[PDB]
Amino acid sequence: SLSPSARRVQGALETRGFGHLKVVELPASTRTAKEAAQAVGAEVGQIVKSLVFVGEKGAYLFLVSGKNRLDLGKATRLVGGPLRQATPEEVRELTGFAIGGVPPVGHNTPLPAYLDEDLLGYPEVWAAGGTPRALFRATPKELLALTGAQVADLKEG
């Protein structure tokens, strides 16, 4: 789409062979999963949140449903050690984008990725397109194909 970050994501999708997936631009004040979901007519649970955490051995990507919160105990047990959130600086360096709009593709560092199993419960999901104001729809199967994420039990419950 228009913004530089959004165009980078559209280009990564095209280069990947997934050019049929389109990055859509939303109202300028969109900043939450609820607002993004409202703009495209989706349930908040269909919004994919890409969270970056840092461990002792490296950084990790957690794709979480907009209706859930990441269970830190579950995250740390998956990685096998303690975790801390990536700083805005680290997220930009690692992913090439800013927190809040981290997309599932086009990163600077290959990060092991985990995908919230609840996202497999919808026919389609909406992932961040480079900024909090951009989104692109994809099926959960396509999301897995794009990221190579391991499906996992991630939510607080």
Side-chain angles (χ1 to χ4, degrees):
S1 42
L2 281 172
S3 80
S5 295
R7 182 183 304 189
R8 287 212 299 291
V9 168
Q10 184 58 259
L13 290 170
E14 303 179 311
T15 296
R16 192 74 75 83
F18 284 77
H20 65 285
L21 300 183
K22 313 299 185 183
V23 176
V24 178
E25 173 125 45
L26 315 179
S29 69
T30 308
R31 306 189 183 80
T32 64
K34 193 164 301 302
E35 298 177 320
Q38 178 177 322
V40 301
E43 304 187 1
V44 77
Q46 298 181 84
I47 297 300
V48 184
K49 298 177 293 180
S50 298
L51 313 179
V52 184
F53 285 74
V54 173
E56 291 173 31
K57 315 173 179 190
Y60 306 80
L61 213 201
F62 287 91
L63 303 179
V64 182
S65 170
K67 70 187 177 187
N68 299 330
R69 285 177 58 75
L70 173 59
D71 186 302
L72 300 187
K74 288 178 182 181
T76 54
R77 284 193 288 286
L78 279 167
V79 171
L83 296 177
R84 71 171 170 71
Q85 295 193 66
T87 60
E89 294 62 57
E90 291 173 318
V91 178
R92 282 176 59 195
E93 180 162 10
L94 296 167
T95 71
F97 305 81
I99 290 176
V102 180
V105 309
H107 303 172
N108 294 321
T109 295
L111 294 204
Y114 297 95
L115 173 93
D116 181 348
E117 68 192 358
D118 284 359
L119 292 168
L120 299 187
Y122 304 96
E124 69 209 341
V125 294
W126 295 80
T131 77
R133 300 169 294 290
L135 285 182
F136 69 92
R137 70 173 292 290
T139 67
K141 270 183 67 179
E142 291 179 310
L143 184 58
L144 283 169
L146 285 174
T147 65
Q150 174 184 309
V151 173
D153 167 23
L154 296 182
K155 72 179 173 193
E156 282 194 11

